[PDB]
RNA sequence: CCCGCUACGGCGUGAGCGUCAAGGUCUGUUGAGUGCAAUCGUAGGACGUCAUUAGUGGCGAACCCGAUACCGAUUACUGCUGCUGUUCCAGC
């Protein structure tokens, strides 16, 4: 018996809150205006100290106690706002409950994470994020073409 | 062609040391119920203090607790996590869970509250067989 | 079509097929000590049994008066018959006596040393002991007393008697839990009582004169915690 | 039969004298396990690897059964054992465990290091491993080193009082034991309770609870109380009474004498045990045949 | 694919005009459940039961899915259902399922009371049962009016998206949701999003993991979201068509 | 090496062949095939064992997880089967 641990990728997605502009209708349209950036004071530490906090005040001590054993962010950037948290194969179904329940950070409101693939292993996580963003580049270049 | 587990019952006792304490203080029903939810604030959080329990013949340093079943550890073991502190009573107290039964038969005194609540859980047991 | 191919994959086979297939008078005596000594153990206990139906012909109780009858109507089969009243002093005196002597117990019992004297019973024989079976993994080996004529790997041999009983008494060791008191001069005021486990010494007493004995995984004695 | 073998002795150095609050909290806590229901306490002192070992034979331990703890198994009916956990980090000149072993009954450590930790379970003749729940895991448990010590012996121990102590530390305990339960293939795992104060005492049915929340199954954490709880007791008890494990100095009675179960009917001055004589060469046959006993 | 049925429409009677930033919003918002990728949307609409219903036969419904949401039914790929939630408390100023039935497409209830979850399990031939978990809960959840009404084709519709309003409301929601969970055998829960705001829509992920961690095994959480889901759907529309 | 242009070695295409070289690649990967190392969760029914206060409840374990495949040997545990040895109890 070694190591099974399970790895989650989540991405940042911030809703459009403007209801006294106008709005357009479409696919690659609206993946542009969900997939926006991310701000300034974002880093590995910042959402690591968020997700403490929402882990802390959402599920408490002992639930943090059985979540922090191996709860360690492997992989972020910035530039595209998709990152990857390694967990437990237990305590996967917590981890995915506390990414869903996270409201704010302490600098910018107004925002909304999905998690979307979740695996034991990180290398095939990587593959079908890269053919997911492939897909995104292909609705892209639809949109863009016509 | 089963059964599903309804709820489970808990049987605790308040085992409270420093005799002083034990003969001056006297815990009251709202106490009980304060204290439960200040220790599943502590050591759990929303969703540990949204477990269902209600209280069932309470005596003087004495608790039956129902709490369902896929539950059931979640509960007892923060029962047995939590110090009471700075809750009206000088001293901290230890708790001590004596058995735990999932079919109804524990033997206490010959009190007659028992025979009450298994009737209201027989009227209830009827209705799950019946419909 | 399956992959569990159970004829072809063992009885059809070439490395499998042969496993088992699928459809299916006195020098002669003396020239070891070894043998000889098994075959005196063996003639012990055959004369014991020949000697409770001997004593079920005789239909009387006493062991007494059975010797003396065997001795009337049975002179060959008397020949080889053990004599535990001969074999209690010609051994016990002498083993305590050793004890006493080796162990440096004497009338001042205020300067023992306990290290040095259960070493001292790590370095001596257990050839020629009473012992004790106290404690054991089967409930009928409790409750035997016995005294050693030959010390076994991981084996104990013993002999007791019953009413009529004269049987050589093979132990186990290997689960067992043995006793052994030694007396002191003074009469009812102090005794000593020392114990042994037979599974954990599992070697010759050849190799008992030399061997530094070590810590072992000691998982299997729940039984002593148990019983 | 339960064992609550970490108990704790509210002393840390040999300059330090515990005052007599102290000894009647123990009292009380002594007390309050003997309340709702315990079988064996091992109580637990703690000394460094750096400190500066006392020369003596009779001073090693201010434990002291025989004065106070003697008048206090009168009225309770239980036994106490002493038991050192060796705090050591670094392979420094001090080494006499000869001495401190064949004083105590359970010789446990506290390793803090890498190399300490590998050199405890090869070399250093302990009974216990524990580990420092309140800090954090030095660098990593592997498998088949825990397993092959399990195999020679000596198995891994969980402290649940110290869960019980602050609100920061739990984290850190849940993330050491269940690192401790999965690197330890759940073979060797004894429980015990470190509570300073008998205002931190549970019931078994709690600890019982405690574990099922933690990961090791239910009927593992009873068998690791009944079965791996009693049998390192009697593998320091035999270490350092008798011989390694060969030749025993206590009285194999029927059912009220044993090594474990009978401590004061044996002279704990140095090794011996006075028993009158029950075993007689002269007319003692086979048991079932006996008639004066 | 997925059913997302309990999106609320921004209105609570039928003399408030809806304004401008209302429907915007409700735009953003149900462009933001296409946006984690949904299949059907079922907006709800919430009526009083004191509330005295209009004599009309085309004025019903003040949702209007084919002249507002008809251009976004053609542009982003989806469509829409009406559904009405019943605020019944008492039985007075009432009894007419026969003309509501036949305009909208689900009707559904919210009981508070403890004669109202009886009115509601014996004479409404309604699709689900909704209650208040938002607010606390009525008396007590039993096995009696549940299993009478859940073995008659009635769901009971828990609302995911009530969570995410105030700190103090979660613990008295996951009371609610865990009663329900309880009382209800882990068969008839539909589980629906009720956010008025882009900013409180999660994924199936995050929902199931919920759902899951609430009480309910993963098969039935699944099973109930796909075939339970697009039963009633197909229940409301057989209650239209046929 | 064959075709066309040009003619001192030349140039353009065959999704043609032979030799040589290159830490460019090897899911070219296997009725499991990962390589920061997947081998799942739940519900219902059938069978076996153990304990019951009305008839149900608990359990299907332990060792260990490969890294191309195969075979033989050794070591850790459960159950069945044959043999041997020991102890205890009697049928005459």
Redesign the pocket.
Known sequence: ?????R?ILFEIIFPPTDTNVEESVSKADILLSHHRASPADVSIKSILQEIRRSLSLNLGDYGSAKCNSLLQLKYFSNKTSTGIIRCH?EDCDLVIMALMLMSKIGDVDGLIVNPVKV??????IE?FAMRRNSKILNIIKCSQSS | ???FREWQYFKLSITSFDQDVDDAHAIDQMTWRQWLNNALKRSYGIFGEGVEYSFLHVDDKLAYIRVNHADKDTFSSSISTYISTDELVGSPLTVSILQESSSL?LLEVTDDDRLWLKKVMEEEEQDCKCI | ???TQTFIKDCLFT??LEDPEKPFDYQRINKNSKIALREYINNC?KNTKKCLKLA?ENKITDKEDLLHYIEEKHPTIYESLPQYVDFVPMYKELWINYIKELLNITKNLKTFNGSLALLKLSMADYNGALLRVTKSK?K??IG?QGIVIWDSQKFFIMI?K?NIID??????KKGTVFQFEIPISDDDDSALRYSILGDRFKYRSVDRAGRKFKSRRCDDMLYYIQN | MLVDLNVPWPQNSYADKVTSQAVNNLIKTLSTLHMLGYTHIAINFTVNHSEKFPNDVKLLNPIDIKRRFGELMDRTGLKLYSRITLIIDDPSKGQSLSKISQAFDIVAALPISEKGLTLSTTNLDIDLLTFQYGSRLPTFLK??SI?SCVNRGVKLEIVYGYALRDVQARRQFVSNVRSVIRSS???GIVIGSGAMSPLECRNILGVTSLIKNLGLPSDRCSKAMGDLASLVLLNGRLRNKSHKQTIVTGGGSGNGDDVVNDVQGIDDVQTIKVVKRSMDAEQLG?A?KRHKP
């Open positions: 018996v070694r190591l099974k641990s790895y194969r695996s034991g292993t990180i290398k095939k593959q | 062609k089963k059964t038969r | 079509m399956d992959r490395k499998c206990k079920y089967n009928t080996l035997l007791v019953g049987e050589i008494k093979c132990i186990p | 498998h088949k397993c293939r759940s073979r086979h079932s």
